Design a protein around this ligand. Structure first.
Ligand code: B12
Ligand code: B12
Ligand code: B12
Ligand code: B12
Ligand SMILES: [Br-]
Lengths: 196, 196, 201, 199
């Protein structure tokens, strides 16, 4: 039953039953819809994995396994959203940030609203990012920070003119760090599309 | 993979919906969203139609397969993004009961960032015109598999359904479109370009 | 708060072409009340309101189409979430001339929820073709949904009698007298259809 | 058209035409099939991207974009190969190795041969990897190294007893470094499943 899908998915992953995990995920998709399954299945399982690690019950390998699975499910949804033409929004994470899920969520929410979000993958050097934005005439750059340490490593103003609009979010980011870096801060992914 | 079409058709004809669903999903993984329509859904649909037209299968078997494929397309349709802004209304001419062409058109538009509202088939023109006007629709798109429903319409019938009116499907040709006051397009890939 | 309270919001979302909003509201209803709840207390009441509003001339065919297509899509989703078990199927359709799908889809859904392999063919299946498919697949039953009475009236006495070992007819277009004339078993309760099949558990 | 697919795909990616890149990739699939498209399209384009970067013709962002696309196509094929039951083989890259494609190829070739290859993602610390292998009762661990420096940083015997069988490959690896690390070395992915089954 739905309230038990999260537990089932997590237990499936922890015993290496990818087939079973995939079926459970698909059930979640059918029940909650695309946005629903992200809010009520993907994120809760990801958090529980994190909490289990933070508590010492599993290691990085189990975490990697679950993240890779969920990244694959999200990439599927990303390609089902389609990719509109027109000036792209480049989506990535700060240098040193290897966690991808936040960035992919942001790209997904934009693409569902008809915004051409180009997900680059994580960990993009800022000069290279600036150059690509300029060449493709990107309207915005969007950064997801799960950890605060990668943002702390950046100098003041580092994000300031990557693109006409620069957005920073994720639990690793706050309004003060965004201001220091010269980015706009946003808490809700659902409002990122509206903001553009 | 070049065997997915045969497998799907045989699965449907023996009423193995579970197997047909898996095969369809394989086709999705392999060919992508637009690809599975070109390489799996439409070929199977046509083979079913041809088999019926040849007298090899009965209406019930055909219905079963068509209903399945309609359901798979509706799934993909709702997985696509839906932007805000003036909608494009998508339907079929009065008397045209076949849905898949219209659904394809709506899907290809939604993938390209166009807010295509699929109404279902068989919409009377005054009612269609009124809805377009009320919602401030930028366009109406009609899919005609049969030519007879178009033939029954008076000259100019489609001319003012919305600021732009497109007619396609194998039931339509450039001369019939001109007679009816619609713009003709053969390729769905060019419909999105024509709007943006 | 009850499911039918969301009906006005859902319908108004649909009528202004806010598909995202309509979908979200429907999904909320699903989370809160569950599938059977939302079907009985949101989907059907809204479908009827749409129909009545059309029958009264308050909305045009296009708006009605839009709403019906939306509700059909939500029901098809639930239908495919119920899964498809193995075993001899039950074929679900509507009589020739009957284009309305929702009743048939409901019947298929309630069977599938109870572990019965209900094959929904779509609507409007000729009887000899239906009989042939039932025979080939070794179907235990056929289920017919009739919203209109005229399609049933057009059929000869006994026409439904031997489509399969069991044949069930329902929908507001059907009554017990017409079912008896046609040789079908008449059935009002969707939740009791599986039980009526006399299968294990 | 086939002889033009690689150039077309690369140019599509470099101008951020994901729709066009996806179609071109699908054409490659129609021509060459699943295994074919990897040898004739995915890998050549990946290498050309790399070479173009190494030559200074594109920046990291363009490379990231193309690699992310190709990673997505490979993950698709990986999950199409299916996942059999039975004791898994864990597939990853050494600590410090962020490149994924080699590992994904290895997992794919195993899965095609009916081996349950669990791709973990890249860059797994060895104690954590050891623990997961133990928990899942994995018969083998497979590591793909494109860079040599991450292997050089590892202590002697570091890969020994991650499972009863441990394989190391990729251009970053050679037989001498594998022996030092306590892994078995191999070059050809088409032989890897057979090499795991047999002694
Ligand atoms: C999972 C998790 C991890 C995972 C991260 C990988 C993964 N699986 O995603 C792993 C295992 C790596 C991890 C470990 C650590 N992480 Co941790 N862990 C978590 C946990 C449980 C969830 C984080 C999470 O929600 N991630 C999913 C992302 C997508 O959600 P999100 O970042 O909150 O972002 C949301 C929004 O901001 C928005 N969003 C995301 N991106 C963007 C971008 C834009 C533009 C916008 C508008 C919105 C947006 O969408 C998201 C969902 O709504 C939290 C605890 C908790 N929150 O309950 C911590 C937590 C974040 N971790 C913490 C940290 C920093 C760590 C550690 C360094 C601490 C340690 N014990 O060593 C380690 C080391 C990191 C490393 N070396 O890899 C601490 C933070 C404390 C602090 N700030 O000092 C937390 C808060 C735990 C705690 N309560 O103490 N962690
Ligand atoms: C499948 C099929 C059926 C199926 C329908 C399945 C279903 N949809 O539920 C069934 C078996 C029901 C059927 C029956 C009939 N159909 Co029939 N059958 C076909 C068949 C084999 C394929 C049709 C098809 O490709 N559909 C899929 C659609 C999407 O393809 P499409 O219309 O070509 O559209 C493409 C493009 O135009 C574009 N597109 C679509 N819409 C739009 C819109 C725009 C704006 C744009 C830009 C692009 C675009 O995308 C599509 C794919 O690339 C063809 C024969 C053939 N080989 O083509 C006939 C055909 C269409 N059928 C035909 C006939 C005669 C019938 C019947 C009337 C036969 C009869 N006497 O009873 C019945 C009608 C039933 C009714 N309800 O009225 C004729 C039509 C002749 C005509 N009118 O000119 C055809 C051509 C067969 C023939 N050669 O005689 N048929
Ligand atoms: C909605 C509706 C429509 C909608 C249909 C929406 C849709 N896409 O499905 C629209 C607007 C299209 C419509 C139009 C028409 N319909 Co109308 N409308 C209705 C309405 C309001 C409700 C029908 C309904 O409840 N549908 C849902 C189904 C599932 O409900 P149900 O059949 O009662 O079934 C219940 C149970 O029997 C059970 N069930 C269903 N099937 C089965 C099977 C089994 C085995 C079991 C156990 C149980 C079961 O499930 C349901 C639970 O409540 C009624 C009037 C009313 N207030 O009831 C008419 C009504 C059915 N319509 C009617 C008419 C006349 C029409 C039109 C012909 C009007 C016209 N002039 O063109 C058209 C028909 C077009 C055509 N195809 O020929 C008449 C039918 C008269 C008759 N048949 O004798 C009605 C009764 C209105 C009237 N009093 O005049 N209609
Ligand atoms: C593509 C590439 C990149 C790409 C990576 C793209 C990507 N997303 O993977 C990019 C542009 C990022 C790149 C950059 C760098 N790379 Co580079 N580039 C290459 C290139 C052109 C090809 C590598 C390749 O083919 N990878 C794909 C994999 C699958 O191929 P493979 O490892 O040969 O594996 C084959 C087999 O071994 C088998 N296989 C793979 N794994 C396994 C496992 C097992 C068990 C088995 C049996 C078989 C097997 O499958 C493959 C055949 O189909 C080579 C140059 C060349 N001509 O080879 C370098 C090369 C690997 N790069 C190199 C360097 C130096 C770098 C950088 C460190 C440069 C720098 N920044 O200073 C960075 C890395 C930055 C970092 N630390 O993260 C060096 C490595 C030197 C060394 N290892 O001693 C090379 C050799 C170039 C050179 N001549 O200097 N590179
Ligand atoms: Br009900």
């Amino acid at each position: 039953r739905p309230e038990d899908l999260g537990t089932g998915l997590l237990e499936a992953l922890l015993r290496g039953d990818l087939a079973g995990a995939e079926a459970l995920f698909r059930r979640g998709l059918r029940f909650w819809g695309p946005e629903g399954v992200l809010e009520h299945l993907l994120l809760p399982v990801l958090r529980e994995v994190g909490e289990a690690w933070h508590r010492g019950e599993i290691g990085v390998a189990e975490e990697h396994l679950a993240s890779t699975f969920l990244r694959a499910r999200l990439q599927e949804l990303l390609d089902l959203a389609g990719f509109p033409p027109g000036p792209p929004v480049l989506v990535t994470t700060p240098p040193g940030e290897r966690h991808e899920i936040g960035a992919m969520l942001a790209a997904y929410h934009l693409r569902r609203k008809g915004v051409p979000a180009l997900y680059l993958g994580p960990d993009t050097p800022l000069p290279d990012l600036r150059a690509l934005a300029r060449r493709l005439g990107a309207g915005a750059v969007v950064l997801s920070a799960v950890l605060s340490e990668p943002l702390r490593a950046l100098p003041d103003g580092a994000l300031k003119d990557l693109a006409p609009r620069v957005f920073l979010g994720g639990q690793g980011a706050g309004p003060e760090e965004a201001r220091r870096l010269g980015a706009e801060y946003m808490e809700d992914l659902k409002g990122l599309a509206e903001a553009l």
